[PDB]
């Protein structure tokens, strides 16, 4: 008794929000992937932080390394609501990175982390969209009596090449850890699945420092948490597994756990339109596990009449507050804040990131419009293949990405 | 030279947010009128607070006469963003009036007001809707060498009986002030209008005090700013006027100034639907003069298909965050937060306050639904007048008010 | 397993901060006793709030019965650091009691309390000084399968008449409860002590409601938690006890638990000087259980030379920020913020509340100076008892209270 | 009229808080000079920011470039109190500097600054300790009708080699600007003084961008605001002067203006002990122009008895809140937060930065003890010259600097 409460308090989170998401290719080109928008108003680092709040861990470390001014701004504006006097804060560590990343990146700020005097460090990732409690994870880490606890999940074998694959024992003890294998070794029972890592580790902190120095001296290591550190603990035999279904926060218990690594642009589009469906897989209307963001004041989403006095028919949409839609059939889309949309437009299966200004008679289909574009009048997008692969970036699955640069290069005056 | 910015600093606002809005019969009988919702996200009082921010007066006094626990909460959550040590704050002054009109609310808390060490005090009576720049008014107050400055606007003579009417000379100096007359006098040039007050007085700091005590040691006055004090000052000739067009904040200078005495319920429906029309009179999309409110983290305005799979139509509407609409043609309406409209409904020119849950097959027309009011399936409002006057409260013009306690009569269990 | 941290989440605290501290004759006759200063920077209520934070109960209800505008302000400035949308907040509930004891303050705001959707409600009566962990108490409450848990501590029999005395069996189940007796009963093993209550009850959510209505529809009860409800529950046998040593937060486990019923003025001087001594009983330097307050930006405690150029001595004292001392030997004293002690003074065992301006050549001994009290030059306090009983209020033990209104009698103009 | 108010609103501040203060030599070695402590609780960037608040410019740009994690932390914790919805914020730009500094450093973030849409940019410095209003400066900049306005002051000729020297005209128009000359050209009237620049410029913003690009293309420039930019505007003839005495905020008007460039270690010590004097030159007890910092909750400054039962005599000291002093004569010192000082110590003319733990019988004289040292027991400092120049850094004027590294190298176990 009195364990699940006293475990977060003695613990501190380290969010590794220094990813780039190179497979998004342009969407994270001007922003760190953790600062990528998602789900109407939120960002991808609003999940990994919220999970720390609602699990009790109010001491967070946001390691913003690569191309992070908007991430600093978001963490400053929305998440600076802490009274440090009671040992709660989201400490915004800049990395000043020297390749040689994420676990050297916890090592550069090793002299700041120590001064928290924490017993259990949570090594998170801030580029994933999950919904988990770590208070149920730390209990499971301390009961087993391990030094490190990896959060693993069974994923398909065709995409398990991109995650850290592992094999566990009866008591969830790591025997064999391999990382990004070309041939993912399946689980013993199911051949179509592999028990892969999620990037959510938990160390007992006095080990962790004690480990990161042995690797800091190491000149032959990659200095990654999944390539030369956990494959070292695994040989030591002190690494245990924590099956993710035990701690995933679900609204209904009859569904598979929801952990989406955004990763690429088509998966971003899928995982951001699944909220616009009838019954979403991610329940954002939850009140026993809410997710916080930088709540900005916008006016209500305005729906006015078109230029001819007609009406706008919005089906399976996710129009957010602040927009102004004039007529314009809007299907299966997700309109972020301030997305003006003028008349006679047909928007189907689109993700319009904030402040996108769509001109008259525009027919957008299966696309992702980047922030603060000015789409001209009469521009069809997504109802052509060879012509949408030449101006904008069309992916292998049909998805289009419209950036504020691709429109400038065509000459459509994005200055506004 | 340097007087335009040193006048707000030496001034303090006194919002007399202790109205009860008696003409708002059942809408305000649970909450004080300053705490009434208007325009999706805002409340009435926000205006009279935001006009104090943008006009530089960052020291406010909210003189909340009781019936309000829901505006103490609103102030404490939204407007508790001040550093009280750099001389900027929103002092929440409980009125604690004797179980004794407006002035006797400033008198009881007159020992708390002196300690602000102010120079010009801005009496507001801020349970109205408008956009004003009070610094303009302070400049006009000091330029004239006045002791009280009343903000006067010409209004129609058929309504001037509700307000204090005044008669000024060439210098905008008050000649004749009559408070709430049965036969309002007209202007010397326009006989159809009347130069009425607006509740916005600006007094000298060291005079009001010397004037309240002299009026507080009396046993004959009603202790009201309009009936007793302003006539007392007019008798001395130290009362000057400020035409409100000079200090009104208009996005378009080709319109007429926007001051709504919201409290009628027939005018609380027209001013709330005024933001749903094609071109509104009150611009909420103005960035040089933004209005702030308590901005909680709501998910986007979700639109989905009906139970059969059809689409939803919207024409000249507002849909704030948290709303969920399924099919159900909407017209001319305004939906506040978390308004789960269900399928096959027909909403026309309605104000749906927060957390209103409209049931299936509900035809709502010219109505004002109080907050958290769970309308049942099949209910029909606004069609046959005698029915709606038999169950709900219907004003003389046609507007209907629906309250939580109003349906429990009819048996429709609420318990949201 | 996972019960230690899921009990605070499903619980809400109700601080009955509506005491008037009648034994604090003139110290609280302007401010409610929860808003009284103690220990330099803190107020009385902070304790009962901070114990709710550190114990995980981040949903509080401050049931402030009126005479308090200076604790509404304190809550709104200091403790308005919550994100109210992640289920953590300090609801400031005005009591608005009929011009009807403690329970009838929870009854009027019983329609606001249901909407929290709580499971265990923590009645506190938080106008005391202590350090407790309520989560320990909730664990002990659910382990016993109880319906109300009373926090009992043994106190001396010569004072137990002030509190409710109880008699428990081996299971800590209440046998006999007598509220504020004239002849308190003693314990079966120690005849010099009495197992008294502490005002800290923990009720089931769905029972209290069902118990308040049953007691609110009566016209015979006093509507007090000690006189009516707890005896009513004892009669059913569903009242269990919680020894307070089990849940007290002690830096040293070799001391006795620290609970001060501050209100006597002779005990508000001893408990405030207890922090000036060599080793205090209440540790304010504890980092695993910090106590928060409103922390304004004050400059350091400046010490300077006298008018002649001599030095100042301090022995066993506290000097908070903003203070300014010039020479003037200080002993055993406690100086609150902005206390400009001037030269040639001799302060011995005194409590100087904020903004006290002591004049030149002032000899202060065994006194409690109210806040902003400008003592004049040459004043002498605590030397000759009959004089201090002729001008100020002097308790039977020797302690003196000095108030702003107390000096105006004598002619010493204050107007700081 | 209506100018001094509307000028800050249309303006934005750019604080160049990227300095190192190379002449402090060790004090800024681990912190950006703007984050250097000063005056008990404050930092050097708490002035340059506060001057922006109390002058109306609530839009600030903090260009943190070099070795800034604590500066980010301070700006996040203390100065993140802004409601961006009303166009007020302290935007914390990281520079990611590529030598080639300060004016290329405003150029890297040229795409963020534009999006404010500001009319007048204030180019401040965050390494100086002044107290000025820029609302009186912008009026003086717009009346003259200049494109740039330099804040200049007459300083001595023996230290005018380290500032930008200039010569003005009758209408304060720059004729000749030279920068860090080896022979400072004096003023025409006074030969012992030179009219030097302060680093506080004001541009009309549409010029500024229009200028920074012409210099961004320039491959032969130093990219500094005082070496190849203002010496260019001066040739253009569009640079005017704003004598600092016109806008310096003084408590009393009979004193010379107070602008201290900390710069070196002896000037740091002088300018930080001048607050501990009887009548300081910098009035920090001002209420019409306060200075904000990260107000942390500490207990009052405790003064206890020594180990033998003696008393501590503090003369002309500035003991801050949080300390614990035991006996120990303390003269002319400045004790920052949490500075424990044990018994029998003699502290004369010292600056003890936060958390310094001084051991028993320590005799410190004319020194600056860096943050979080652990000074051992019996260690004399400053009462020897040849022995204080060999362990610690002794300056040419006698001042000593004790760092947490110089003590480790002696072997005194700074880990704590
Ligand atoms: O190429 P540009 O001109 O920077 O435009 C790209 C847009 O993306 C942004 O960087 C948005 O990034 P965020 O993800 O931080 O919102 C804007 O600054 C800018 O308008
Ligand atoms: O009096 P009833 O019938 O219980 O209804 C009360 C409802 O009205 C309200 O008092 C309206 O108050 P708010 O302005 O705070 O929303 C709500 O608190 C509650 O939902
Ligand atoms: O009633 P008096 O004589 O005017 O004295 C009032 C003083 O006491 C107080 O009411 C004490 O209240 P606080 O607890 O808010 O400090 C002060 O507001 C004021 O300084
Ligand atoms: O050499 P160390 O171990 O970093 O110690 C130097 C000290 O200075 C600090 O960097 C303080 O810097 P700040 O100026 O930001 O307070 C501490 O982190 C540290 O204790």
Report on the architecture of this protein.
Four copies of one chain form a homotetramer. The first copy, chain A, starts with 5 loop residues before the first helix and ends in a 6-residue tail after the last helix. Chain A has ten helices and 26 strands. In chain A, the strands form seven sheets. In chain A, strands 15, 17, 18, 20, 22, 24, 25 and 26 form an eight-stranded mixed sheet that branches. Chain A has a seven-stranded mixed sheet with strand order 5-4-1-6-11-8-12. Chain A folds into two domains: 1-285, Spore Coat Polysaccharide Biosynthesis Protein SpsA, Chain A (Alpha-Beta Complex); 286-416, Hexapeptide repeat proteins (UDP N-Acetylglucosamine Acyltransferase, domain 1, 3 Solenoid), CATH 2.160.10.10. Chain A is an alpha/beta fold and 416 residues long. In chain A, helix 3 links the parallel strand 4 and strand 5. Chain A binds chain B through residues 39-41, 276, 278, 284-285, 290-293, 295-297, 299-305, 311-321, 334-335, and chain B through 39-41, 275-276, 278, 284-285, 290, 292-293, 295-305, 311-321, 330, 334-335. Strand 13 (312-315) of chain C pairs antiparallel with strand 15 (312-315) of chain D, so a sheet runs across the interface.
Q: Ligands bound here?
A: 1,6-di-O-phosphono-beta-D-fructofuranose
Largest interface: A-B, 34 and 36 residues
Query: What oligomeric arrangement do these chains adopt?
Result: homotetramer
Please state the structural category of chain A: alpha/beta
CATH architecture of the largest domain in chain A: Alpha-Beta Complex
Query: Measured on Cα atoms, how large is the radius of gyration of chain A?
Result: 23 Å
* Overall geometry of chain A: globular
Main sheet makeup of chain A: 8 strands, mixed
Share of residues in strands of chain A: 15-25%
Name of the level-1 CATH class of the largest domain in chain A: Alpha Beta
CATH topology of the largest domain in chain A: Spore Coat Polysaccharide Biosynthesis Protein SpsA, Chain A
Number of strands of chain A: 26
- How many H/I helical runs of chain A? 10
**N-to-C CA distance of chain A:** 59 Å
CATH superfamily caption of the largest domain in chain A: Spore Coat Polysaccharide Biosynthesis Protein SpsA, Chain A
Number of self-contained structural domains of chain A:
2
The helicity of chain A comes to 10-25%
PDB class: transferase
Keywords: ADP-glucose pyrophosphorilase Complex with FBP activator, transferase
Assembly: tetrameric
Entry title: Escherichia coli AGPase in complex with FBP. Symmetry applied C2
């Amino acid at each position: 008794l009195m364990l699940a409460r006293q475990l977060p308090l003695k613990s501190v989170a380290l969010i590794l929000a220094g990813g780039r998401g190179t497979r998004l290719k342009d969407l994270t080109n001007k922003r760190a992937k953790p600062a990528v928008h998602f789900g109407g108003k939120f960002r991808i680092i609003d999940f990994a932080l919220s999970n720390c709040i609602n699990s009790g861990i109010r001491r967070m470390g946001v390691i913003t390394q690569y191309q992070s001014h908007t991430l600093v701004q978001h963490i400053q504006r929305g998440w600076s609501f802490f009274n440090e006097e009671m040992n709660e804060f989201v400490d915004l560590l800049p990395a000043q990175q020297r390749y040689r990343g994420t676990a050297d990146a916890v090592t550069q700020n090793l002299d700041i982390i120590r001064r928290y005097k924490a017993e259990y460090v949570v090594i998170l990732a801030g580029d994933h969209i999950y919904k988990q409690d770590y208070s149920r994870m730390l209990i499971d880490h301390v009961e087993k009596g391990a030094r490190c606890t990896v959060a693993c999940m069974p994923v398909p074998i065709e995409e398990a090449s991109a995650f850290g694959v592992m094999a566990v024992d009866e008591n969830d003890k790591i025997i064999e850890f391999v990382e990004k294998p070309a041939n993912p070794p399946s689980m013993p029972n199911d051949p179509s699945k592999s028990l892969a890592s999620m990037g959510i580790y938990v160390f007992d902190a006095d080990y962790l420092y004690e480990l990161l120095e042995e690797d800091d001296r190491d000149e032959n290591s990659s200095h990654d948490f999944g390539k030369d550190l956990i494959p070292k603990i695994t040989e030591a035999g002190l690494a245990y597994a924590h099956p993710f279904p035990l701690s995933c926060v679900q609204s209904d218990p009859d569904a598979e756990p929801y952990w989406r690594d955004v990763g690429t642009l088509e998966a971003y589009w899928k995982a951001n339109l699944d909220l616009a469906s009838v019954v979403p897989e991610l329940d954002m209307y939850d009140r026993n596990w809410p997710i916080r963001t930088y709540n900005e004041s916008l006016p209500p989403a305005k729906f006015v009449q078109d230029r001819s006095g007609s009406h706008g028919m919005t089906l399976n949409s996710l129009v957010s507050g602040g927009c102004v839609i004039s007529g314009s059939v809007v299907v299966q889309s997700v309109l972020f804040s301030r997305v003006r949309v003028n008349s006679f437009c047909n928007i189907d299966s689109a993700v319009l990131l904030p402040e996108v200004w769509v001109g008259r008679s525009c027919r957008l289909r299966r696309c992702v419009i980047d922030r603060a574009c000015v789409i001209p009048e009469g521009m069809v997008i997504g109802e052509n293949a060879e012509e949408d692969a030449r101006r904008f970036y069309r992916s292998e699955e049909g998805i289009v990405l419209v950036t504020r640069e691709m429109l400038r290069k065509l000459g459509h005056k994005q200055e506004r």
